[PDB]
Amino acid sequence: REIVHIQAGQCGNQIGAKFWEVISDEHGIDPTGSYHGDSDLQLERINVYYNEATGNKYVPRAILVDLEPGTMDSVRSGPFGQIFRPDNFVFGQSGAGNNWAKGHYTEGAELVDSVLDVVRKESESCDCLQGFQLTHSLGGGTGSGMGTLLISKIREEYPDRIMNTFSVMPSPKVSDTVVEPYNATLSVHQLVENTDETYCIDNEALYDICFRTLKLTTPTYGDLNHLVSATMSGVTTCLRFPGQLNADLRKLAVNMVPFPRLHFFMPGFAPLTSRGSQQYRALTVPELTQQMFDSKNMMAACDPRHGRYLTVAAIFRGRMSMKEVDEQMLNVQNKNSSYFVEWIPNNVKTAVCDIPPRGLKMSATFIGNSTAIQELFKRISEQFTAMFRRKAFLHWYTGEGMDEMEFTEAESNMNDLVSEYQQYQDATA
Amino acid sequence: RECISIHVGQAGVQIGNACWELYCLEHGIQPDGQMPSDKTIGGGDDSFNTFFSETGAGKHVPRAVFVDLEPTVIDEVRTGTYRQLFHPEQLITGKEDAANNYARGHYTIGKEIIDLVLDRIRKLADQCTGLQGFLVFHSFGGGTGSGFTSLLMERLSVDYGKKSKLEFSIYPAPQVSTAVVEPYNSILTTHTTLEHSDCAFMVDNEAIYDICRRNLDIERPTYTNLNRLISQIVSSITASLRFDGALNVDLTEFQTNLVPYPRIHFPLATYAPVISAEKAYHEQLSVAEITNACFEPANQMVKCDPRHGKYMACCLLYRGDVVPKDVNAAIATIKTKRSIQFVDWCPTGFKVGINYQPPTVVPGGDLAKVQRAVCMLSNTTAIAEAWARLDHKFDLMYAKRAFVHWYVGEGMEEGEFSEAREDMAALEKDYEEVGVDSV
Amino acid sequence: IQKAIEENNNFIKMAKEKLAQKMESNKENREAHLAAMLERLQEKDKHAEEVRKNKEL
Ligand SMILES: */C1=C\C(=O)C/C(C)=C\C=C\C(=O)O[C@H]([C@H](O)NC(=O)/C=C\C=C\C)C/C(C)=C/[C@@H]2COC[C@H](C1)O2
Ligand SMILES: Nc1nc2c(ncn2[C@@H]2O[C@H](COP(=O)(O)OP(=O)(O)OP(=O)(O)O)[C@@H](O)[C@H]2O)c(=O)[nH]1
Ligand SMILES: Nc1nc2c(ncn2[C@@H]2O[C@H](COP(=O)(O)OP(=O)(O)OP(=O)(O)O)[C@@H](O)[C@H]2O)c(=O)[nH]1
Ligand SMILES: [Ca+2]
Ligand SMILES: [Mg+2]
Ligand SMILES: [Mg+2]
């Protein structure tokens, strides 16, 4: 049951490379693709993300895409850069100039066919393809515009497969590129319609965690992506290790997505405590549980206590008592009862995986489908409107052949997503 | 009088593994299928031949088919301890499961393997000289356990007519469930199979979980712990078919008493004793003790309160060192002391069977080995409480159409939901009507 | 005995038919869901043409 991974653009390639590094370490796969680990858990579902080659080598089922060569040259020289299949690198020369229209309709469209060629060569040797995961940013041009283009073309060729994204949302705390709201709004318009599940990885939240919680006074992309890759590791543990719950993309979607458009998840990670506070606060199951339901541990900048949960998946990792996990999960639900909609019974599911992330005895990862995600969409919506009402920078998009109406429609779709979250928040049994 | 077992989806398969392992130990059948005590090579008409065929090389082969829409649970049967007991062809897998979606098990994925499953069951039926019926094991909650089972039972009614079909059905609990949509799947499959099933024994995972925690002192029961207890209950029920003896009363005869109207076909099983080795030591549990325990609600396989409904039948299936005299004295004690009200249109006597073969336990298990055990099967109106709990969960979600798009996307319609739910409301009402007094 | 045969045959029949009707309705419904999806996706390829065309002017 194979997944095919695509990473597009700088952000997409940067966090995708880290994902492959982290999960390769967890599965005992070295930079040459050789297995050199201790435990049979590591190979049992290796085929989900890796093809096996001659020489007992494991090769990521991964496709690397950009409209410029730079980041992919970096990827190839990165740690684990020689593990990817050479033929799986598809790049143009142009760049997209932080312009969604260029990624989606112009330069991206010229390259998308050669990407699809490689997607199909990977898909066709799968025993039973589950679907696709895409990593990209929404705020630039290629991950945003070409990524959402790829999604729609893949969905045409594989309409009954699951489409999952890890989508990095822009924040003025990390990038000052003024057109980011335009590109994110246009991209969300696509995601709403064409993905089954999207992890909202919000740069605002990654910045706040690094700065406020971990006390990094000048967060780098490296610091942000360390959190992202930890989160990505957590939210894919159920796909990659033997287990009962959410063991495949479609089972995850059936448990997490009650209405097709409401498929935007708030991810979380515990623990997130400074080295300095660690001298005082012990790392325990109650601590993880309390932290994973706290807004400061969320990787989208939304306070769940400002909305209600439709569905939650809680994954614990490491050696710990199942009994204690069950008790804490019951306790945290009882203490937060009001924030779980009554009309979906038993809407929080819990798994435990024996293998902890590197450098921790235990962790927890949270995946919430909360109506408070509306706060991320409203933030983007307000930055979008402040520009669009003065028609700022529109010429960059209309000169690629777009008209105003496509912008009005994308805004409208996103405002309707917000309203739909509100409706389910306000609905009673 | 052969019985063919069909194990569907994860729960069905894993409970099947535990049941066949126990049956092998009860009968002296080794993991290669050899049975030295059987002196007729290549066949016979012994009581254990209801459940096992024989090859000329002396292998005793379960009359069983295991089917799952993905391979990883059945692959553990294929490579594990009892791998040689089964022909490859009795273990059948697809590649992609039903993703907790009844619609996928019944239609989208199910329809691709159904013909092959029916073809394998036919090869079993063809070796039988007097097939009596099927036993079908499955979850309510999974997409395969729910929707593939429904499909199979409809197809079996077509291919074998009115041949009896019994179910062992695993009713969901939150402590071990894996899908939010289990209530949907439960009501969809219950509605679909209701006219195709002659008798169904529901097993509430939460009652089993609680018995494991409370009586076996297991802190956090696994499926392996649940399944070992479940197999003891299943074995109690099928023992009448697999062993002989003058006081052994066949399951079909109990069923005559258990099923007053075709729809009212869900007995409540209660089993005793469930005790740990540490507690069983220096402690003999008498016939009176185990019988008393069958009227304790905490020992029931489905959480409900029989003291607040009415009985339409009570059957006691004993195993081991039990004589009628002790049974009669225990029943008489219980009649004077317990909350046992029958509907006015049914006789109030208990029906008793005794199989002398002592109960057995699997090595490395949790249950003490005991000299005598009992499974009570009662038909009480209280079992409808279990349908009421599931119906309410269905209603909360369905009023908002939560998750319904996953089913509609696989070709289902809203009408199928409301039809299923209406059938359940009618069944709840059937249970109310049979317990009202005659005018 | 003829009544018993007749009711057995009638139960088989009605079950065979209900199941063929359910399977057909299911098949058509699912195919229509797919065809609607594909048609939304083709409307997008068309709009993408119109954009690259509008650019050329
Ligand atoms: C990334 C390692 C890296 O480059 C820097 C190093 C050597 C360590 C970073 C640790 C870190 O970020 O730890 C985070 C928390 O601060 N730790 C705790 O809160 C620990 C105990 C708390 C007790 C109350 C946790 C994270 C985000 C760890 C991730 C997990 O994935 C591997 C990745 C390695 O670190
Ligand atoms: N967390 C994180 N965000 C990043 C990273 N690189 C870029 N971003 C964010 O991504 C957005 C910019 O989009 P990019 O991914 O750089 O652009 P692109 O997809 O390469 O598209 P073009 O550069 O226009 O051809 C901004 O919001 C950046 O903050 C990264 O490594 N990590
Ligand atoms: N008692 C018990 N319950 C089980 C076991 N395995 C699964 N279940 C329960 O069955 C339900 C889940 O359905 P499964 O049988 O896993 O699913 P499936 O039939 O394989 O269906 P799909 O996986 O969706 O194709 C939940 O209520 C689980 O707790 C088991 O071995 N024993
Ligand atoms: Ca013999
Ligand atoms: Mg950039
Ligand atoms: Mg399954």
Side-chain angles (χ1 to χ4, degrees):
Chain A
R1 300 303 311 288
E2 299 88 352
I3 295 178
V4 168
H5 171 90
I6 302 163
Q7 47 190 71
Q10 177 169 56
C11 176
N13 270 284
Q14 274 176 191
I15 78 166
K18 285 296 166 210
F19 169 78
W20 285 105
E21 163 179 342
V22 169
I23 69 151
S24 296
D25 159 73
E26 296 186 2
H27 297 268
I29 305 292
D30 83 15
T32 75
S34 290
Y35 174 72
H36 271 287
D38 59 294
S39 160
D40 321 286
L41 297 195
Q42 301 169 293
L43 291 191
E44 195 157 295
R45 303 182 86 206
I46 196 75
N47 287 121
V48 175
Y49 278 98
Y50 298 82
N51 296 312
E52 188 173 341
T54 310
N56 284 326
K57 300 306 184 163
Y58 293 91
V59 179
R61 193 167 310 98
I63 308 172
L64 300 82
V65 187
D66 207 340
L67 290 168
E68 67 187 334
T71 313
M72 279 170 50
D73 296 6
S74 267
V75 162
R76 207 179 278 103
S77 296
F80 288 78
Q82 297 294 291
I83 213 192
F84 299 108
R85 200 186 310 292
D87 316 275
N88 281 24
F89 290 74
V90 186
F91 54 95
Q93 307 304 304
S94 53
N98 299 132
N99 184 335
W100 186 96
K102 279 179 174 182
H104 200 82
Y105 291 124
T106 310
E107 330 293 326
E110 293 187 310
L111 182 68
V112 74
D113 290 349
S114 58
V115 174
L116 288 169
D117 289 344
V118 174
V119 171
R120 185 177 312 123
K121 191 258 141 212
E122 285 292 350
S123 292
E124 277 182 348
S125 74
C126 292
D127 181 50
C128 192
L129 176 68
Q130 315 191 22
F132 301 90
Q133 59 169 60
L134 167 74
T135 59
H136 59 148
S137 60
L138 301 197
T142 300
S144 202
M146 198 189 174
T148 52
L149 181 68
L150 274 162
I151 288 168
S152 62
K153 307 301 281 199
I154 288 163
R155 193 128 185 116
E156 244 176 303
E157 256 184 74
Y158 307 88
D160 71 14
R161 304 290 81 200
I162 295 299
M163 179 68 62
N164 171 225
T165 67
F166 297 87
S167 297
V168 178
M169 319 274 177
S171 167
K173 283 166 177 191
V174 182
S175 187
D176 57 14
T177 307
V178 300
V179 288
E180 286 186 7
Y182 281 163
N183 301 322
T185 293
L186 291 167
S187 269
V188 166
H189 182 43
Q190 304 289 304
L191 293 179
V192 176
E193 299 303 338
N194 291 318
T195 69
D196 296 298
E197 47 200 357
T198 292
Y199 296 95
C200 297
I201 310 273
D202 184 5
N203 268 348
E204 179 104 5
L206 302 173
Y207 182 88
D208 290 341
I209 294 170
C210 287
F211 185 85
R212 290 158 153 261
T213 307
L214 310 185
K215 309 294 179 215
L216 305 173
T217 64
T218 307
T220 63
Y221 282 128
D223 300 322
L224 301 197
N225 291 351
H226 175 260
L227 292 174
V228 176
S229 57
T231 304
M232 283 182 66
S233 178
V235 311
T236 63
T237 279
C238 293
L239 304 170
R240 291 185 286 115
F241 295 106
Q244 267 311 297
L245 172 76
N246 293 334
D248 71 69
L249 293 177
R250 189 182 303 284
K251 284 185 168 180
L252 166 71
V254 170
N255 278 340
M256 289 301 286
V257 181
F259 304 102
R261 293 160 57 87
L262 313 187
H263 61 257
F264 292 90
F265 305 153
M266 297 171 59
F269 183 95
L272 295 169
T273 299
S274 57
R275 282 181 184 114
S277 301
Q278 288 173 39
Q279 313 174 88
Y280 305 116
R281 184 183 286 301
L283 177 55
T284 69
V285 176
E287 180 75 33
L288 289 179
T289 300
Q290 179 174 317
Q291 278 201 35
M292 73 193 307
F293 279 86
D294 185 52
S295 63
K296 305 165 157 85
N297 285 63
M298 298 303 170
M299 304 289 160
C302 300
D303 175 0
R305 289 179 178 77
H306 297 167
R308 287 196 171 101
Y309 290 123
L310 302 178
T311 54
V312 171
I315 310 92
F316 293 83
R317 295 184 70 178
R319 301 192 69 269
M320 62 188 74
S321 153
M322 295 296 332
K323 180 170 80 107
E324 194 184 7
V325 170
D326 289 0
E327 282 163 351
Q328 291 303 127
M329 285 304 304
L330 283 177
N331 172 265
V332 83
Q333 289 170 86
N334 287 328
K335 288 180 183 178
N336 289 263
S337 49
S338 310
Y339 295 113
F340 292 96
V341 297
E342 274 322 90
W343 43 270
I344 306 183
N346 309 114
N347 62 342
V348 178
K349 292 304 175 213
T350 301
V352 181
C353 170
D354 280 339
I355 291 159
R358 178 181 209 156
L360 287 172
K361 318 228 213 241
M362 58 174 75
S363 62
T365 293
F366 173 90
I367 313 174
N369 191 346
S370 173
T371 67
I373 196 75
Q374 67 177 274
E375 291 183 331
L376 176 172
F377 297 114
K378 278 159 182 203
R379 188 198 74 226
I380 299 310
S381 177
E382 166 193 49
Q383 297 163 331
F384 177 96
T385 198
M387 291 176 103
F388 188 66
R389 68 183 177 95
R390 77 158 190 295
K391 297 190 175 173
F393 299 87
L394 269 188
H395 79 268
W396 282 11
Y397 300 82
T398 60
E400 302 298 311
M402 297 185 60
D403 61 354
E404 286 196 51
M405 195 72 88
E406 170 161 2
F407 280 72
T408 294
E409 283 158 3
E411 173 193 58
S412 265
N413 204 14
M414 193 160 74
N415 291 336
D416 292 341
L417 177 69
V418 161
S419 308
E420 287 148 37
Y421 279 117
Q422 190 59 39
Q423 155 189 10
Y424 287 115
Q425 186 182 303
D426 288 338
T428 178
Chain B
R1 276 197 166 86
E2 300 89 357
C3 299
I4 289 176
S5 295
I6 303 163
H7 298 282
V8 180
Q10 179 176 299
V13 162
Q14 296 187 147
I15 291 161
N17 284 339
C19 286
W20 287 99
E21 166 171 33
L22 177 59
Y23 293 165
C24 284
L25 290 168
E26 283 176 19
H27 290 298
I29 298 165
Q30 297 163 10
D32 63 2
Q34 293 291 320
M35 177 177 177
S37 66
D38 184 1
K39 311 302 189 200
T40 56
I41 319 310
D45 66 2
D46 298 304
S47 264
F48 56 82
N49 290 120
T50 52
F51 272 62
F52 293 84
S53 50
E54 296 185 45
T55 70
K59 184 183 294 206
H60 296 63
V61 182
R63 302 192 191 264
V65 171
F66 288 70
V67 51
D68 201 2
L69 295 186
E70 64 104 2
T72 60
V73 183
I74 286 181
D75 278 349
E76 288 306 284
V77 180
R78 301 176 169 134
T79 55
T81 299
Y82 284 92
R83 72 188 174 286
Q84 292 167 89
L85 197 66
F86 304 105
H87 192 290
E89 280 197 9
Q90 295 171 249
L91 306 172
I92 304 172
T93 48
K95 292 181 172 288
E96 168 169 54
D97 68 24
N100 282 326
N101 182 344
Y102 174 92
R104 287 172 59 89
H106 193 280
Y107 306 94
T108 307
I109 307 305
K111 76 184 180 336
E112 290 306 345
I113 206 177
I114 182 62
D115 294 320
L116 171 62
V117 174
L118 287 164
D119 295 354
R120 298 297 174 75
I121 286 161
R122 175 63 59 189
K123 294 182 63 145
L124 293 183
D126 289 351
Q127 295 170 58
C128 293
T129 47
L131 174 65
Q132 176 205 112
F134 302 93
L135 309 186
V136 187
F137 293 74
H138 67 106
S139 69
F140 276 173
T144 298
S146 66
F148 187 78
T149 302
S150 288
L151 169 65
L152 172 62
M153 297 282 278
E154 294 163 301
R155 287 301 281 261
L156 289 170
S157 284
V158 175
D159 295 355
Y160 295 92
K162 263 167 199 170
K163 210 99 278 188
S164 73
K165 301 200 293 297
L166 271 56
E167 310 173 72
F168 289 91
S169 296
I170 308 306
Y171 176 108
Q175 293 88 340
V176 292
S177 69
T178 38
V180 180
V181 293
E182 292 193 42
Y184 288 162
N185 293 331
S186 302
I187 273 79
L188 299 163
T189 186
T190 293
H191 165 57
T192 289
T193 66
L194 190 56
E195 67 206 300
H196 296 291
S197 178
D198 295 301
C199 186
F201 301 104
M202 287 196 284
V203 183
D204 179 357
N205 269 350
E206 195 174 349
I208 305 306
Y209 193 93
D210 279 344
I211 289 157
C212 286
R213 285 203 290 203
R214 182 221 316 105
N215 295 2
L216 294 179
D217 317 311
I218 305 163
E219 297 184 21
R220 206 300 179 179
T222 64
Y223 282 149
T224 300
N225 304 126
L226 306 181
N227 293 348
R228 286 172 159 162
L229 174 53
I230 298 173
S231 61
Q232 298 287 348
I233 294 130
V234 168
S235 166
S236 285
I237 294 164
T238 62
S240 50
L241 303 177
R242 291 179 292 113
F243 297 98
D244 210 50
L247 291 175
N248 189 55
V249 168
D250 204 79
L251 183 60
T252 65
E253 185 174 310
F254 289 120
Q255 268 172 260
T256 308
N257 274 18
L258 291 164
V259 183
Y261 311 84
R263 288 155 70 79
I264 306 304
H265 68 227
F266 298 95
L268 178 70
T270 305
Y271 175 93
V274 181
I275 189 186
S276 75
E278 293 78 357
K279 299 273 203 261
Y281 183 65
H282 292 351
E283 161 162 316
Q284 60 193 76
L285 281 180
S286 82
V287 176
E289 282 163 335
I290 62 169
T291 307
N292 289 343
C294 288
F295 289 86
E296 279 295 323
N299 299 327
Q300 290 168 187
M301 296 295 115
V302 177
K303 281 179 84 133
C304 55
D305 195 358
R307 319 168 301 130
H308 300 150
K310 297 193 193 171
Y311 287 90
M312 283 167 286
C314 193
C315 304
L316 291 163
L317 287 64
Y318 294 89
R319 88 197 298 191
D321 174 49
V322 173
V323 291
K325 173 204 161 158
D326 299 321
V327 176
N328 296 338
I331 287 164
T333 291
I334 280 151
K335 275 170 187 306
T336 72
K337 294 189 161 163
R338 290 264 177 179
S339 213
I340 307 171
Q341 174 170 58
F342 278 83
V343 303
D344 61 11
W345 51 260
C346 165
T348 73
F350 299 5
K351 191 174 158 61
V352 175
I354 303 174
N355 275 281
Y356 293 113
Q357 159 98 358
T360 305
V361 296
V362 163
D366 313 291
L367 281 174
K369 183 115 156 31
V370 300
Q371 285 192 107
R372 56 191 80 70
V374 61
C375 179
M376 172 164 98
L377 304 177
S378 57
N379 179 25
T380 161
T381 61
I383 201 140
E385 293 179 50
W387 313 129
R389 289 188 306 267
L390 221 36
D391 290 340
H392 178 64
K393 291 177 193 309
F394 184 106
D395 295 337
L396 284 166
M397 285 193 300
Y398 190 74
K400 313 275 188 282
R401 300 301 189 280
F403 300 95
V404 171
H405 74 278
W406 285 108
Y407 291 75
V408 161
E410 289 293 359
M412 289 190 66
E413 348 194 293
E414 281 191 1
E416 300 175 61
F417 279 75
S418 55
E419 177 196 295
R421 175 62 181 91
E422 285 158 357
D423 193 15
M424 293 310 294
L427 187 71
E428 286 190 48
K429 194 180 162 202
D430 294 340
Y431 271 98
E432 294 158 28
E433 283 160 356
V434 293
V436 176
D437 294 334
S438 304
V439 183
Chain C
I1 191 169
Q2 290 271 32
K3 186 169 179 205
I5 287 161
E6 173 74 280
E7 289 161 357
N8 186 65
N9 292 345
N10 188 260
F11 175 77
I12 292 169
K13 197 168 91 92
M14 270 174 24
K16 181 177 218 133
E17 279 160 3
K18 261 160 214 151
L19 189 49
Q21 169 200 45
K22 280 192 306 188
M23 293 313 268
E24 283 309 280
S25 137
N26 178 267
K27 174 165 82 85
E28 304 171 340
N29 291 347
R30 192 175 182 257
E31 281 174 3
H33 298 316
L34 291 163
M37 167 174 336
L38 296 182
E39 184 185 341
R40 289 184 303 284
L41 290 164
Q42 296 173 52
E43 273 314 300
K44 297 157 60 57
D45 291 334
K46 199 158 180 194
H47 174 82
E49 289 307 285
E50 177 169 21
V51 162
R52 288 188 282 281
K53 158 190 162 51
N54 169 289
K55 184 193 186 190
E56 199 171 57
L57 315 146

